[model samples]
Target chain A: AFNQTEFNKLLLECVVKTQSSVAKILGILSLSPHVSGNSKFEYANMVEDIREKVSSEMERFFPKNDDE
Target chain B: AFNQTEFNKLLLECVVKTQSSVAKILGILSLSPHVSGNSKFEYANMVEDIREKVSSEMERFFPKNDDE
Candidate 1:
């Protein structure tokens, strides 16, 4: 069986590849002058939640060493 | 509240530190002559999930601007 790919490798690849697509999507949506404030707030909150969860998990996985 | 360190900082540090340990663990496990295929698959899946979550979160945090 093939071993699982490392998280670091996956993260790096995502940065290199998927980031542009995400930005494009967000930019297109942001341009709609009629986009409701509530919708915008919800989108921002959702993104923030995802960010916090992921950041916490990563820190747990790769904890800072004594020198950090 | 102390300002949270940027997601970029956390991500960069994880890439530098825990990545090596993670690779080493996988390498050692792969060397085991009798490790079960199911167990190996599970381990791989868990790592992939973590990777995807982290990548998605990072993209959300440091979005690309027009010049990007």
Candidate 2:
């Protein structure tokens, strides 16, 4: 039988790895057009918000004593 | 010159699409080992939390009157 504890471990491993990948893609996209946006401020703010969200979400996967 | 408004729109479009991908991957992972976990309660909670995050993140992209 598949062990529950063991399976959860693998599951979390997947979660953490995939989480990084998502962040990485978003990070790359963030640089798409630093020089443009309908409004420069809106462009910068939107990019900044996304970049921040990616980092925050990534941290959820690798927190100290993290068990999610 | 590249238009800032147009570029930001493209940038946000990308953000919204990519965000959906992250959610989808996590959703698939959530079903990986429903029958197992060191603790059943913990496993359920973790998956639920991830599911919630995905929905919340996805909304950022297509929010009613959404910006960024």
Candidate 3:
């Protein structure tokens, strides 16, 4: 049986992992005043794209764990 | 019409976008020798999870442009 708890844990972990990337990106942008917010803005959109895109797919691909 | 080329272009952009985050993460880890590689290792897995999960979903959610 697919451990629902483990799946949730992994899902949360991924969220944290990606969210940290967003923070790290902000850190890099902070490094240079010359670097416009352009990069981070675009990057953040893509990150969200990945999240919404994946969660929607995970729903389609992964069935509910046989429990309600 | 959902332009396939636009979709492909956006897809490439996102690949570059997230891939840069991975590089950025590595860069941050490089500065601190004390920081264990554990974070990056787990992060890489999650990143790939995003890629595979999203690509698979994009396929399922997005239709061909009928030009095919």
Candidate 4:
């Protein structure tokens, strides 16, 4: 039973390690500019454009794995 | 003395109007992106460039009055 528990922990750790980077990327992409009094859409679009560029760079660095 | 007070109030109002517009323009220029871990200089430069563009536009719209 203890061995099974350890195996489950390791599996969870692997999953976390694999997914955490992408989660961080998403978080960064949602950032907004600090200035207020302007249209929110303007700031959102700026963030989206920046995120797209950063994500493209990330993809180049870490290509998707063929196996699940 | 009553007429002088009224003139002073009007002069003060005009000064506030001109200065407040510039202040608001400066406020908008100070806006920074929400992303973390970015270089401060990068953000500062972005703001400076934006401020320059906006100030140029303002100058174009309201040229300097030499009689000031």
Best by DockQ: 3
| Each model's lDDT | 0.50, 0.60, 0.53, 0.46
Error of 2 at A30 (Å): 24
Classified by CAPRI criteria, candidate 4 counts as incorrect
Question: How big an interface RMSD has model 4?
Answer: 23.8
List DockQ, one per candidate, in order. Answer: 0.03, 0.02, 0.04, 0.03
lDDT of 3 by residue, A1-68 (tens): 54554444444444444555555544344444454465654656656867787788887768566553
Question: A1-68, model 1: which lDDT tens digit per residue?
Answer: 64444654566566544444543444444444444353522346535544565566666655556355
- Model 3 misplacement above 4 A: A1-57, A62-68, B33-68
- By summed lDDT, the worst window of 10 consecutive residues in model 4 chain A runs over A17-26
Worst 10 residues of 4 chain B by lDDT: B23-32
Model 2 segments beyond 4 Å from truth? A1-68, B38-44, B47-68
Model 2, span B1-68: residue lDDT tens? 33567656755785678668756754555565653563543546867876797677445444555444
The estimated TM-scores of all candidates read 0.30, 0.32, 0.31, 0.23
Name the candidate, 2 or 3, with the larger DockQ value: 3
* Tens-digit per-residue lDDT, A1-68, candidate 2: 33567656755785688667856755555565653453534546767876787676446544445554
Clashing pairs in 3: none
Of models 1 and 3, which has the larger DockQ? Answer: 3
How much of the real interface does each model capture, measured as fnat?
0.00, 0.00, 0.02, 0.07
